[PDB]
Design a protein around this nucleic acid. Structure first.
Ligand SMILES: *P(=O)(O)OCC(C)(C)[C@@H](O)C(=O)NCCC(=O)NCCS
Lengths: 134, 50, 49, 50, 72
DNA sequence: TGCCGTTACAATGTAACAGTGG
DNA sequence: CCACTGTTACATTGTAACGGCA
């Protein structure tokens, strides 16, 4: 356990995620009958502003197949929330043309390094080549 | 330094509470005895106003 | 540590310089000793004759 | 042997560099919040020094 | 000109505007920046110019003008 | 194993720059 | 000039797959 978990924050995250999924059409609840599903969704909607009861709501009506996805989404949300405080711990997202990405991933898989490590090593070698020439 | 640091938070909270309490009053407190006379004046004002 | 390392580098430079001086002295001594060996051989030959 | 220590110094230098950007960014962010909170918020309300 | 760096950073580090700082005044007492604030200011100046300033030289920047005097 | 950090993506939304033709 | 288009460099959120560890 590296990042401390805060209930009033992660519960709001879970509520927002479930509301988003419901608005997206995902079946939040395990009830195939539409009446029970709608009733549970209404309970959730009126359940806003409550961690201790949204957790119970999840335990009681949550769709079995979404547990893993919700858990990993909350994991990622927690990690990003804690890393977004400092500049050096943040992550920069870019888009690479498919050939360039293909070659870079080929190198990374070949050497066992990650994309960041592979690019760092390559840049260091480029600098070393510059110094060699210079 | 560590002993003073351990003592610190209690003293700081005490100072803040005392400052708030005194500023709420028109007077500024400076001694335990002074707090006692303030209590006596409070009792006098209470027994009058009642 | 930066100042300490720079100063140690300067000390290193000084010792390297003095050992270069000793290397030059060694070369000069080598020439002189070549001459000395030549002299020894000449004296040996003269004694034999 | 000393060239390794020089490389370690370079590592420490980059770490110092990083800490320095962190600190300067923190102060840049702080500036504005001080400026706004000087509307009596910071006097005693927010600054719970305890 | 290049001084726009200093006269900018100073403000960004002290909450004052570009014209607020006066060359005759002193950071330590005439700008409200305490020891920690002045350390932060000098270290931000160091960061901005990608250079280094030892403690001894750094301590002689208590006045507004010095911030450019060592720079230019 | 199940949780928890971590990586490498995918999909969509925006700001900024460079071009192109009316 | 001006508008509309193409492109790059991000952000934001979600997900699956590894690998560490109780
Ligand atoms: P002041 O009450 O703002 O406190 C300043 C400070 C003691 C926290 C510190 O920032 C400071 O000004 N230190 C003086 C310089 C110093 O100690 N340098 C050490 C270099 S290893």
């Amino acid at each position: 356990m590296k990042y401390q978990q805060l209930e009033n924050l992660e519960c709001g995250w879970k509520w927002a995620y479930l509301i988003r999924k419901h608005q997206e059409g995902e079946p939040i609840t395990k009830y195939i009958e539409n009446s029970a599903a709608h009733a549970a969704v209404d309970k959730l909607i009126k359940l806003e502003s409550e961690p201790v009861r949204v957790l119970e709501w999840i335990e009681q009506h949550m769709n079995p197949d979404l547990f893993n996805r919700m858990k990993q989404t909350i994991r990622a949300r927690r990690k990003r929330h804690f890393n977004a405080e400092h500049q050096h711990t943040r992550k920069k997202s870019i888009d690479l043309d498919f050939p360039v990405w293909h070659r870079l991933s080929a190198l990374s898989q070949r050497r066992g390094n990650t994309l960041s490590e592979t690019i760092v090593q390559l840049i260091e070698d480029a600098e070393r080549k510059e110094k060699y020439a210079n | 330094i560590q002993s003073l640091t351990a003592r610190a938070p209690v003293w700081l909270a005490a100072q803040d509470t005392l400052n708030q309490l005194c500023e709420q009053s028109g007077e500024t407190l400076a001694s335990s005895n002074d707090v006692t006379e303030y209590m006596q004046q409070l009792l006098e004002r209470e027994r009058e106003a009642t | 540590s930066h100042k300490q390392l720079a100063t140690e580098q300067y000390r290193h430079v000084e010792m390297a310089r003095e050992l270069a001086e000793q290397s030059g002295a060694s070369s000069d001594l080598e020439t002189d000793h070549q001459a000395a060996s030549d002299h020894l051989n000449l004296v040996q030959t003269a004694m034999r004759q | 042997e000393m060239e390794n220590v020089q490389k370690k110094l370079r590592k420490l230098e980059r770490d110092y560099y990083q800490i320095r950007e962190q600190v300067v960014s923190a102060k840049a962010g702080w500036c504005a919040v001080m400026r706004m909170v000087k509307d009596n918020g910071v006097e005693r309300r927010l600054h719970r020094r305890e | 000109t290049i001084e726009e760096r200093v006269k900018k950073i100073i403000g960004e580090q002290l909450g004052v505007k570009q014209e607020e700082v006066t060359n005759n005044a002193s950071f330590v007492e005439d700008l409200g920046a305490d020891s920690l604030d002045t350390v932060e200011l000098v270290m931000a100046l160091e960061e901005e110019f990608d250079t280094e300033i030892p403690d001894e030289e750094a301590e002689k920047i208590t006045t507004v003008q010095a911030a450019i005097d060592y720079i230019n």
